[PDB]
């Protein structure tokens, strides 16, 4: 069907199984002193994390104070200059002998592809943390400073009123 | 189109009667019993007329073929189109007749003719019983 | 190879986010009638803490199951209103998820 069937073990665990789970896990721990499914109550025991700390799904694999970059910068600049130079040479190829133009085209793309690699090491979450950091920091400083400004102006008004009433005495 | 027009007007008046009985039941105070009986009987006999007239003109309704308008936009009104398109019964009625058939559960044909003869015999017996005593 | 129970339970949890899946599951009588399914739903609650929460793909179901948790004391009735209510309350629920995680 369109919707896959519920998992099979879901139907094994009734309320009686839930209430008898404590004694079952106590007995299992006492006896113990891929997990084989010898009893229907085994699944409620929390599954163990794989030792390799890896998870595979759909053909793809998955697994501290914030809780020479100049070399990369100059590499990027020289790569951009070389990319412009190669673009000029490739368009010249198109001009004179376009029949073999593709011979350079993908080459240029490789440099562009390398640029993407040069982005990968530069990857930005810390920079986003920084920018959010300063925006809420400056917002709270603005709120604070307007608080002492308003309380100070109220106090100044109170002192002026006190002087006015003392003069009228 | 004439048959569907008559179906339209009769079903419209039936829906009007339903709206009526609705807005006189929605009141916090229940009216007299007799008014409720009158409304019930009128609306229910009207439903009978609806059923009979829908029975009469099945051929005209069947002959008609449903097709969306060229001017009607389905991109924006696909939800509205699907709302009227769907026809599956409400589930509770479904398991209702499922349990009904479960409870009910050449042999069947001869039971059928035995039911025929019981029906005819009972009809004749009650005709005789009515004729036995003068009711006028 | 045969996937482990981790993979199937995680995929079930992430598929619970679909409104169509929830509507289909609640359409059948015996799914809600059987206490086994709700027992499994309450068992699934323990994935809201790390490091399990680091393995999720769509955080919305995190509330949905919790919303489904509410369904055991709110009633089936309300199944029809489920798509409308999720569409209407998507903004504030996304905001509260962001507050729970992004802050």
């Amino acid at each position: 069907s369109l919707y896959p069937p519920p998992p099979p073990y879901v139907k094994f665990f009734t309320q009686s199984n839930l209430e008898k789970l404590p004694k079952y896990k106590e007995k299992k721990a006492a006896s113990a002193k891929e997990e084989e499914i010898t009893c229907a109550l085994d699944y409620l025991i929390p599954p163990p994390m794989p030792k390799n700390q890896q998870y595979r799904a759909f053909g793809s694999i998955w697994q501290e104070n914030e809780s020479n970059y100049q070399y990369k910068i100059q590499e990027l600049r020289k790569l951009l200059k070389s990319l412009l130079l190669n673009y000029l040479e490739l368009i010249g190829v198109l001009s004179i002998n376009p029949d073999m133009y593709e011979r350079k085209v993908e080459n240029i793309r490789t440099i562009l592809v390398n640029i993407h690699h040069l982005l990968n090491e530069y990857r930005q979450s810390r920079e986003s943390l920084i920018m959010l950091l300063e925006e809420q920091l400056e917002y709270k400083r603005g709120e604070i400073r307007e608080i002492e400004q308003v309380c100070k102006q109220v106090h100044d008004k109170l002192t002026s009123i006190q002087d006015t009433l003392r003069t009228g005495s | 189109g004439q048959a569907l027009d008559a179906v339209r007007m009769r079903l419209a008046q039936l829906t009007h009667s339903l709206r009526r009985i609705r807005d006189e039941m929605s009141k916090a105070e229940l009216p007299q019993w007799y008014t409720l009986q009158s409304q019930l009987n009128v609306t229910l006999s009207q439903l009978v007329s609806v059923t009979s007239t829908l029975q009469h003109f099945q051929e005209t309704l069947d002959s008609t073929v449903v097709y969306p308008l060229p001017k009607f936009p389905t991109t924006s009104h696909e939800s509205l189109v699907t709302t009227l398109l769907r026809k599956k019964n409400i589930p509770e009625v479904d398991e209702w007749m499922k349990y009904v058939r479960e409870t009910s559960g050449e042999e069947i044909e001869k039971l059928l003719q035995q039911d025929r003869e019981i029906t005819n015999w009972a009809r004749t017996t009650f005709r005789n019983e009515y004729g036995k005593h003068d009711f006028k | 190879p045969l996937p482990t129970r981790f993979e199937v339970e995680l995929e079930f949890i992430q598929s619970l986010a679909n409104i169509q899946y929830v509507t289909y599951l609640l359409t059948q009588q015996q799914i809600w009638k059987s206490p086994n399914f709700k027992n499994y739903l309450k068992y699934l609650e323990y994935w809201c803490n790390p490091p399990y929460s680091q393995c999720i793909v769509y955080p919305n179901c995190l509330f949905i199951l919790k919303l489904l948790n509410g369904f055991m004391e709110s009633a089936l009735e309300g199944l029809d209103e489920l798509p409308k209510i999720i569409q209407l309350q998507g903004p504030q629920w996304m905001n509260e998820m962001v507050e729970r995680w992004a802050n």
Binding site: S1 | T82, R86 | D80, E81
Partner: peptide, 25 residues
């Protein structure tokens, strides 16, 4: 003329009961 038109009694909240099953290829 027409004494009164009918009030709109649309029920979009109705969930419908369309059976879906031939999705797998």
């Amino acid at each position: 003329p027409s004494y009164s038109p009918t009030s709109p009694s649309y029920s979009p909240t109705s969930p419908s009961y369309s059976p879906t099953s031939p999705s797998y290829s």
